[PDB]
Amino acid sequence: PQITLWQRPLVTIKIGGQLKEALLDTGADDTVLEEMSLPGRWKPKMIGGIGGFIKVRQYDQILIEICGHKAIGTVLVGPTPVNIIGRNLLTQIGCTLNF
Amino acid sequence: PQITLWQRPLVTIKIGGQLKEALLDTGADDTVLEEMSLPGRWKPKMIGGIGGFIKVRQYDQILIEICGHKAIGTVLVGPTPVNIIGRNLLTQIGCTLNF
Numbered sequence: 001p002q003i004t005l006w007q008r009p010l011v012t013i014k015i016g017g018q019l020k021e022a023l024l025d026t027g028a029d030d031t032v033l034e035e036m037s038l039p040g041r042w043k044p045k046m047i048g049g050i051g052g053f054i055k056v057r058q059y060d061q062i063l064i065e066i067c068g069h070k071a072i073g074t075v076l077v078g079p080t081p082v083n084i085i086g087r088n089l090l091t092q093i094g095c096t097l098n099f
Numbered sequence: 100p101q102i103t104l105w106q107r108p109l110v111t112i113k114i115g116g117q118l119k120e121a122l123l124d125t126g127a128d129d130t131v132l133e134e135m136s137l138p139g140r141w142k143p144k145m146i147g148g149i150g151g152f153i154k155v156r157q158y159d160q161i162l163i164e165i166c167g168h169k170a171i172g173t174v175l176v177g178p179t180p181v182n183i184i185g186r187n188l189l190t191q192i193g194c195t196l197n198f
């Protein structure tokens with residue numbers, strides 16, 4: 001699809017059998033989900049944003065469905081206020097900016 | 100034009116007589132620029148992202164040129180690590196997400 005930006009580019013995703021809303025973020029290298037019940041092993045990570053920094057949980061090769069389009073890749077889980085879909089997944093589902 | 104997301108979607112902006120590089124960010128409601136010589140009156144403000152919050156200086160009705168495209172709007176100035184073009188200005192240049 002095509003999405004205009006008058007509103008947040010919020011979308012439905014499905015991950016670890018659960019349905020969640022998530023923001024399509026071109027300013028994010030990574031995908032960061034709020035605290036959630038995810039299965040598998042992980043590795044400790046530190047990431048940065050406008051406010052400062054937070055510690056995440058690195059989940060690799062995780063399946064996720066974004067607006068009907070499936071992708072596998074790294075998913076970070078931590079103290080973020082919004083679920084964020086970053087370029088590691090945005091490239092996957094073939095998403096582009098247009099103007 | 101069309102911008103894929105294999106690399107950060109960085110663009111050349113001109114503002115206040117000066118040339119900078121700014122990141123096209125669909126996850127940002129607002130435009131936030133690093134500290135810069137900007138003329139005029141402004142108003143304190145507090146904003147948040149991953150990591151926490153920063154206080155910015157708010158400039159209303161500032162002209163800015165993005166990849167050739169002229170737009171006028173609010174620009175925020177403060178301790179952001181990088182230049183961010185937000186949805187307030189992204190609408191003004193007809194920018195959309197596509198996938």
Ligand SMILES: CC(C)(C)OC(=O)N[C@@H](Cc1ccccc1)[C@H](O)CN[C@@H](Cc1ccccc1)C(=O)N[C@@H](CCC(=O)O)C(=O)N[C@@H](Cc1ccccc1)C(N)=O
Pocket residue numbers: 025027028029030031032046047048049050081082084086122124126127128129130131146147148149179180181183185
């Ligand atoms: C900037 C304002 C107007 C306050 O909006 C946001 O903060 N919007 C955020 C959405 C949000 C919604 C609700 C609540 C809080 C936040 C986006 O995530 C903003 N996108 C960029 C804004 C930005 C870019 C560059 C520098 C500072 C700030 C971002 O933080 N991108 C992060 C997303 C998190 C992530 O990718 O894991 C990023 O790529 N961070 C990199 C790059 C980096 C590294 C170290 C320091 C600074 C940046 C990283 N791997 O840490």
